[model samples]
Target: CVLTLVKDDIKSDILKLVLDYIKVTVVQVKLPEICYDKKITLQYKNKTYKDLFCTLYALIDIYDCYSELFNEDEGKVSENEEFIFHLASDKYILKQSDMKHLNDLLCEKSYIISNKHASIVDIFYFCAIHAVKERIEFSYIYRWYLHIQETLLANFSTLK
Candidate 1:
């Protein structure tokens, strides 16, 4: 009854790795990548955006309804991906406090994404475009995503 999503061009093993990453995070730390690339089913378009959004709402709440993670370590690096590495340090060992903060931030982002009058998806995409453009604000967006990823891994502990 869950909507599983994936990129069209990812290798099976790599995709599996991502799925495994999500499944474990959801179970262990209550996160499942709020921004997901949905895998389109061959013959199912009956579901409206409402359905998807509603389901996502429940999923987001159930996954990390009462918790969050804190992310202060903005990337102090030159490369963009390294910022991600900085945000979510331990993929194999996620900490509880960090997971809690991540869960909170994700809920906030998802709220923005689900708002009726907002282009949350566009906002996310814009951030991507800005990153390539090397716009400075991309730092903030990049940090947020890294926070989510690191929080995913941090379900296990952080250095504190």
Candidate 2:
């Protein structure tokens, strides 16, 4: 069944911008804020609202892409067994150094400023792809995203 939402057009346009934002930032390894300001200059839009919307939508996209790779079926023991078996054999497992690098890239202002907008979507997308390619757990990538989201959103909120 197909579903429609009110203001779908607006959402489509905004989502398009978000996708483009993620793409450009990832390619250039630049900061998101520069690209965001360049792309969205409408008078009525607020940074806080737009940031939250972009982050939320980016998360939805990530879930769509990676959720199946690392999810567990709690009610079905057989399914869980197979899942765990595959996980044990396939997962690459992140090291402390890898996590430290990720944290530094996402959370350090100096690195962020130097690299440009550590766009949440871009970093998450990077992590997601790495997870898939390296057989790392989706949960680890998602947890990093959550931590970055909390840190960035709180910082943004306090800017007001």
Candidate 3:
């Protein structure tokens, strides 16, 4: 089940309309200006796009470590495994509160699943938030996501 969490506001209205149209027509359309009007612009306030990209790049390493640990599991479940499972599950909802929590978690150094997992989840949250706020194209985000995934996997093989 692809769970969609839409806020009860004009922003969500526009987003939902575009998403529904894309679903029905099976075509990617440029998002309307309403979707970006109230966007969070942190780029002008001591933050750069490179900062976001660097955080995402670091996430690949965390994901790689978790992937290796999970694959080598022998009848032992770890906290990282549980969180990763939750992340991979379709039931997971990306809500504003959750994003806020992720942000708070990213601000700290310790967490239930260690800083690494926290960073990983926070990076995913950052990506989604950045995409929505910047009105970035989904295809571009998806392409970059897959590219990062493949790049890490290739590096894993090279190291092994």
The candidate maximizing TM-score is: 3
Q: Which lDDT value does model 2 have at 103?
A: 55
Ranking by lDDT: 2, 1, 3
Q: For candidate 3, give the lDDT.
A: 0.33
Per-candidate TM-score against the hidden true structure: 0.26, 0.21, 0.28
Backbone clashes (count) for model 2 = 5
Model 2 lDDT per residue over 28-143, tens place:
32213322332322122232323334444443344342222222222233442353333334442445565555455544432221233333333333333234542243344445
Tens-place lDDT digits, model 1, residues 1-160:
3344444322222222333334543354423332235442211235423333344334434444212111113221132234334332443233445444434544546322322211222222222222354224334444555543443323321122
Cα lDDT tens digits, model 3, 1-160, are 1112223332233223323323332332332122222331112224432222232223223224334233234323364456544643633446655544544543443322343322233223222333555223243334333433343222111111
Q: What lDDT score belongs to each candidate, Candidate 1 first? A: 0.33, 0.34, 0.33
Of candidate 2, the 10-residue stretch with the lowest lDDT total is 1-10
TM-score of 1: 0.26
Candidate order by TM-score, decreasing, is 3, 1, 2
Model 1 segments more than 4 A misplaced: 1-50, 60-137, 153-160
lDDT of 2: 0.34
lDDT over C-alpha atoms for residue 125 of model 1: 27
